[PDB]
Structure formats: structure tokens, C-alpha cells
Amino acid sequence: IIRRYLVKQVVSTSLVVIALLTLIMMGGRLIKYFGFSIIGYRMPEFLTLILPLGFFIGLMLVFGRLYVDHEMAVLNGSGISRIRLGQLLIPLALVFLVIQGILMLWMTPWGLRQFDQLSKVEALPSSKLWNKWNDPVIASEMGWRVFGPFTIVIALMMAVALCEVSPRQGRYYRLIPAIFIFASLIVLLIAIRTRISRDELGVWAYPAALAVYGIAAALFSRK
Amino acid sequence: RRIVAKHVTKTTALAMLGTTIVLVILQVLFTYWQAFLYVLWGAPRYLYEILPISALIGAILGLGTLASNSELIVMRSVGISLWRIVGWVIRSALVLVLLSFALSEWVVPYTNERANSVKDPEDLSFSQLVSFMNYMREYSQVPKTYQLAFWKKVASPFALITLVLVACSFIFGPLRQQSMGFRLVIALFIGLGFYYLQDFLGYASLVYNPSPAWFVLGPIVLMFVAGSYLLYRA
Amino acid sequence: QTLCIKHLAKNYSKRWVVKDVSFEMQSGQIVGLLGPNGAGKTTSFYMVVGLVRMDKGEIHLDNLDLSDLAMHERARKGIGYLPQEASIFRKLTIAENIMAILETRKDLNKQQRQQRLQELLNDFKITHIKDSLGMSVSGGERRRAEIARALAADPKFMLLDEPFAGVDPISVGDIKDIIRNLKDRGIGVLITDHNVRETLAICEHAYIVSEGAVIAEGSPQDILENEQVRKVYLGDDF
Amino acid sequence: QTLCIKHLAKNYSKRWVVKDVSFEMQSGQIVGLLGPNGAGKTTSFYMVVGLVRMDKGEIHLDNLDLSDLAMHERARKGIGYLPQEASIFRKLTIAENIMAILETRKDLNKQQRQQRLQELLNDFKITHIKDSLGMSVSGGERRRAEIARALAADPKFMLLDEPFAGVDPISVGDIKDIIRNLKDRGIGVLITDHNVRETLAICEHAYIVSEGAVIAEGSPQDILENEQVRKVYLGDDFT
């Protein structure tokens, strides 16, 4: 009952944030493009970034709401920690990992393939990129598609760590400080995709970037 | 009344200037030895484009501190109207408007020349823009991309004051009794919403027959009317 | 002066929290607006001040209709408000808080403004903290500066919101002495409070509002011996 | 069982809010942690619950240290918390509110979880409203659902924060029966409240925390006759 309570809350507020970020992230690009089929073919490209951001923000809004209106004091006071509440959402995070794995591996290339013809390694089919790991350009793109979906898991254990907020501080107090901590992971991963494409860093740095953020989030959640 | 006016003005002015210092530092870092001077010389041009959005966040945080501390309730409890408290905040914004004029007229056109040496109609200063348009009009037809640039500059002080009044009306209206984080989040959505709306309607003025004055002064008049209505609801 | 208030009404989420609340208050008299929590004592109190817009009702102050006036337009007519929460100007000194509202007065010049400020500080015994910031004073000392600040505007009716909120039994006498001082100054006091034991000890005429309507009226002695109030609000033992 | 608290301390902004607060509460006994507002009675209460991190001292429950355990680890030892503000799960059914905590219990199976929920609803006379949402109930009925939910975790000590907060005199007696019932259930109750007059009417052992330290201890009759309390907290005239 407590797992279904959280999953229903997180899914409801993540879809609101995702639809709010899609209207903002691609409303800005649509205006720049104006300066309807193009937006349709770039849905999987932007939702590749919005989905980890929507899940992270939606996780902190739910965990912020539990703290603000004292539903966390009665959950900790009943024997259910905050770490335990984050472990109840692993089945949900696995669904979002599978969902984004579909976007990153299939629809992001397919969406970029049709857009390119209408308007590159960003749009090549994943079948043609499974092999040819020797070439750093394919190595960066294929690694971006395999280790990319695992930002959902990192968005789960890092939103649990950075959600503790006082009732008087507010539900939105820890949003801007911690969205930048999450965004620093994605900005680092985009900054890693470029380094691998120039054969300067190696494909091994994708799990290393996640592990450093994974261990840092796990240590901070257990302080 | 002077002591109350100074307290409201100084608190908002420090919030508008405090947000300005932070927003410029972040934008300098985000934009970023030869490449450091090129970004450092561009600070006045980054400063000019932050003033409309730093005044919005400054009035949200400046009045939010007053509202959350129940200081705006006891100014009304003694007979100080909402439009008087807005007028005191506008005095703080009038420093940013005067700063916008100083940057536009004497600072931006100079550091832009210095920045380009280290390494558009929008980039032209108002003194250069009006003089150039008057020169073209005397011998040829002025393009619609210069009329839009002219209207986007003459309506820059009026977009700073209107966006401040909207911020003040939100504190007294929808954003009353809300958290400081929620006010900051909403202040960021209005800032992006205004930048996108003025960008889109700027492009739409170059593709449609009506003059760019309608598209540039459109949102400013509507936000002023809508913002002044939220103040009438108290 | 009489503050006639007739047929107040207000709805929230299509539910009428206040239904026909009407009471009369006179200058130089303490009137307690009491009742069960959430039954409309707070909402009816805020509609007198002006925070909550009046859906229906008439508020008169010596045949002068204040119904349509806003919060500030009523405050200029002589209605004061003392918030329950800390409402002192944090970055202004205690003497500057009182002087801030004294400059609002039109019938005072600079010469008598300083004289009025001096006696207001002496009346509430906050002279020793007149130079300390409002954010660095005791809760008991700060509350005396908020009442002194409200009196700088020369109100005719001071509407106190939760005066005995978080007040220890040792300092409940200090608040009663303050409220009694406001009455002796010719200012009517309207008190809404959850602490009904002490609010029924200073007020001369109390109004108990339950289910959104005034269910009883009269002196505190008559309020106690009221069957409907005893059954609904005060209980059999009190 | 005897909850032992020794030498609590906590400094906020380089100011020692709590200085050497120590009290003992036994199971089945109601203890009122009172004192002047802002004198450290609220902060000392929170260090017992676990909201604010301790800065000096120790907490024992039958030679079983709880100082290093977090808030959730003490709850499994038998320590409950009831926030003063509305802490019900707003969008959960009242029957599900008690059930959400009953599923936490390891010593109950499905067969006896529904039985425990059914008797918990009947013990608090909320079985008629057991099908309504948490946010769509009366203030008096909501608090009865928060105490039934707290008992679902089966605590040995309940730390009530401001139980008589925003409570009409008609419904003060209803809470008195609830707290008396908690004592009759073998569960010790620790109460911190600003309403000292009504808190002293049910507690058999009250602690007065002034200037950050415990200055009084014993039955409410001994507290009233104490000249140190009547000088700082209760005043000359108080009953």
C-alpha cells in the first residue's frame, strides 16, 4: 500500500513535469525553428533528456511533499526510512529505465533518421552500430545509447539523497540546488560523449561517471 | 513617509542588484587567457540582457522576503495602499532602467568594439541605431529588421517596469503565503515565458504585415493590464 | 463610535464557511470573537480586517460604509490589525518601526512626531531596546513593539489576531495588562483566539460563532451559562 | 521498560538551546515535558524523537543505546511520533492509512492483519468513516485516524507533540480519553504542549524545562507547589 501510494504519486507528478518540460524545452526550439512534422520527429530526442529530468524532479516533489505535510515524520516514525522508501521505487525506476532504453536505442535513431531526410551517427540504426566498436565516433554514440538509460537509476538514488527539507523551508526549496546537481551529471555525460568521439577519453568513462555520482549519492543518503 | 519608503526600496534594490551579480557571474561562467578577455569584455552586453530578468527575480525575492515575514500585512494595516508599495518597488527598478540606458548609450557600444577586436541590428546601440535608420530613410527604405530592433530597444525600459509590476502583483495575489522556493520557481517560468514570447513575436513581426510596434508593445501592454488587474483584486 | 457588522458571508470550495455572522462593537470596549476552530471565527475576523474579500455583508463604522473599501482604505478609517505571527520590520530598529508609521500620520509635524515616539516607547517599556534590530529581540519584547507600532497610526478599533498564542501563563498577565491599556486609551479591541479560558476573562462582551453563525451573545457570564454553547463549544465542565 | 534520557544538549547558532536535560519515562506512564515557550522544551522533545541530531548526551531503553540509531531505527524499537500538524496521508483511504503501517509489521500475516485493522477501527469509532479519503474528514476524526495509524506500528512509547493544539474545549476531553486509553494499553506517553493547564490533568509525572535545563520533577501537585516553577513559568496565580 505504501509502495502503490508512492508510485501513483511519482508517476502522476513526473508526467506533469515531463509535459511541462516538453512544452518549454521544445517550445524554445519550435520558436527558433519558426525563426509540425519536425516536432513529431524530434519527440524521442528531447524526451531522452526530459525523462531523467522529469523523473528526478518528480521524485523530489513527492519526497518534498511527504516532508512538508508531515507524512515523512509518520513514515520514519513507523519504521520506514527514507532509504527504504527509495528502494520501494526500484520497480518503477526499472520501468523508466526500460522506457528510456526504448527511446535511446530505437526511437531516437528512428526519429533522427526521418528528420534528417526531411530537413550523421546520431541517426544510424542500432543494428549497424552494434559492431564497429573500434571507431571512436561509433564508440561514443553506442556507449551513449547503452549507458545512457542508466541515468534513471542514478536519478533515483540521488533524488533520495537530496530530498530532505524542513517543513518551514518549503517543498520547492531544494529543487534548484538539486536540479543543477542532476544536470551536472547530464552535462558531464554530454561532455564525455564529445571526448570519446575525438578518441581522447575512452568508452569506459560512462560507468565511471555514473559510479562516482552513484557512490556520492549513496554516501550522502546515509549520513 | 520616508522611512517605510527607504525600507521597501533598499530591500528590493539589494535584491535586484544581488540577483544581477549572481546572474552575470553564472552567465560569464556558462559563456566561458585570450578567451577570458573576450568574455570579460562582453560582460556589459551580458549585463544588458540580464536586467529585464534580474528585476523580475529581484522583485519576487525582494518582496517575497517582506511578504513571508508578514511585513507587507502591517504596511496595509496602517494605510499604505498596494499601488504605493508597487511605486516604491518601481523606484528600485528605476535604478536598473537608468543602468540600462547607461549601458546602451555609452558602455555596450564601446565594449562591443573592444570585444570584437580581441577575437547586427540588435547589437547596435540606440544612438547608432536611430542615426543609422535616419540615414537610410533619407536615401532608401529602412528594412523591417531595423524597425523591430528600434522597437525592442525603446520598449526595453517599459518591459522592465511592467515585468516588475507583474512580479509585485503575484506577491500580493497568487504567490501570497507560498514558499520562497515556489516564488523563485514561478519567477523563472515568467522570465522564460517572457523571453520566449518576445523572441517569437519578434520573428512574427518580420513575417507579417503589421508594424513591429504591435508585436513588441503587445505583451508589455497586456502584462501591464493583467498585472494591474491582479493588483486590483488585492 | 460603533462598528456595525451585519450578515457576513463567505464560501470556500463551494462551501459556506461563514453564514450570517453579525455583531456590534463600540469604541473603548473589548469584544472577543470566539468559537470552535474552523467554524468561521477566523474567517469572519479576517473579513473585518480586509484580508478575505466579502462575498456578502455590510460593515459600518458610524454610518460610513467600509464594505467596498480595501485593506488599506479601512486602515485609514481607524481599523488596526496585529498579526499572530512575527510582523516586526526585521531590518529596522524598534524605534524606527514606530517612527515608520508615525510619518504616515498627516496631522503630526516633525516636532511632535519625536515627542509622540518618545512616549510610545515609554508606554510599552521598550526604550532599552529602541536601538536594537527587530530581528534580535525577545518574543515578549517584540510583541510589545508590534502593538506600539500599530498605535502609531492612531487606530479606533484594534483587531488582535491570536494575542495569547504561544504565551506562557507567567506572561499572560502582561498581555492582559496591554489589552486593558488599549481599552483605557479609548480603543475598542476585537480578540479572536483559540485560548478561550483567558479571552473570556478580559472581554466585556463575547460573540460565540459556531457552524458559521452567531449562536450566542452577551457578557462572559451569560456565555458560560448558555446551553447551546455548553453543548457545542465549552463542554459540560469548564 | 524504562526509557532513560541523560544529559541532552543542543546548540543553535552558537547558543546552547538545551543544557543538561535528563528525564525517565516508564511504560504505561504518562509524562508531560512542559516548560516556557522557546526555553528548550520543544528542542529537547525533538532530540528524543530523532528529528534534530543530538549534540551531547545519550538515550537508553533498558541498557539498549538509541543515541546512534536514526529516527526509523528507534521506531522499530517501539518509539512513535505524532506530529502536531495534519500528518495523515491525504490521498489514502483511512482504512489504508492504518493498513499501510500494518504491512510494515513482520509478526503479522494477512489473516491477522485484517483482524488487527478491524479492531483498531472499532477501538477508535472510525469504522463508519473508514471508506473516506484522508483529506476529506473532520479535524477531530482526522486525529483519531492518526492515533489508530500510530498504534498499527505497535509502539511501546508514544511521543505526542502538541496533542491539545487547535482543540476546542468540547473535544479536549475526547483526547484525554485517548491518552488515558494509551496508558491503559501499556504504552508510555510523552507529551509536550503549550497548554500546560490541560496537560497537567492527565500526566502523573511532569518535567519543567527552563533556560535549557530541567528545573522540576514529580507529580503535578509537586510542580504547582514548586516556587521555582511559579516564578518563571506558572506565575503567582495559577491553577
Numbering used by the authors:
A (entry chain F): 2 to 36, 49 to 132, 247 to 350
B (entry chain G): 4 to 35, 49 to 135, 241 to 355
C (entry chain B): 10 to 247
D (entry chain A): 10 to 248
Q: Which passages does the manuscript contain on this structure?
A:
The impenetrable nature of the outer membrane is due to the presence of a large, amphipathic glycolipid called lipopolysaccharide (LPS) in its outer leaflet. Assembly of the outer membrane requires transport of LPS across a protein bridge that spans from the cytoplasmic membrane to the cell surface. Here, using structural, biochemical and genetic approaches, we show that these antibiotics trap a substrate-bound conformation of the LPS transporter that stalls this machine. The inhibitors accomplish this by recognizing a composite binding site made up of both the Lpt transporter and its LPS substrate.
LptC also contains a TM helix that exists in two states. In one, the TM helix is sandwiched between the TM helices of LptG (helix 1) and LptF (helices 5 and 6), which form the gate through which LPS enters the transporter lumen. In a second state, the LptC helix has moved away from the transporter. Movement of the LptC helix between these states is thought to be important in coordinating LPS transport with the catalytic cycle of ATP binding and hydrolysis. We obtained a structure of A. baylyi LptB2FGC in the presence of LPS, although density for the LPS molecule was poorly resolved. Despite several attempts, we were unable to obtain an LptB2FGC complex in which 1 was also bound. These data are compatible with a model in which binding of 1 and binding of the TM helix of LptC at the LptFG gate are mutually exclusive. Superimposing the LptB2FG–LPS–1 structure with the LptB2FGC–LPS structure identified shifts in the conformation of LptFG, particularly in helices 4, 5 and 6 of LptF. This conformation of LptF creates a pocket between helices 4 and 5 that better accommodates acyl chain 6 of LPS.
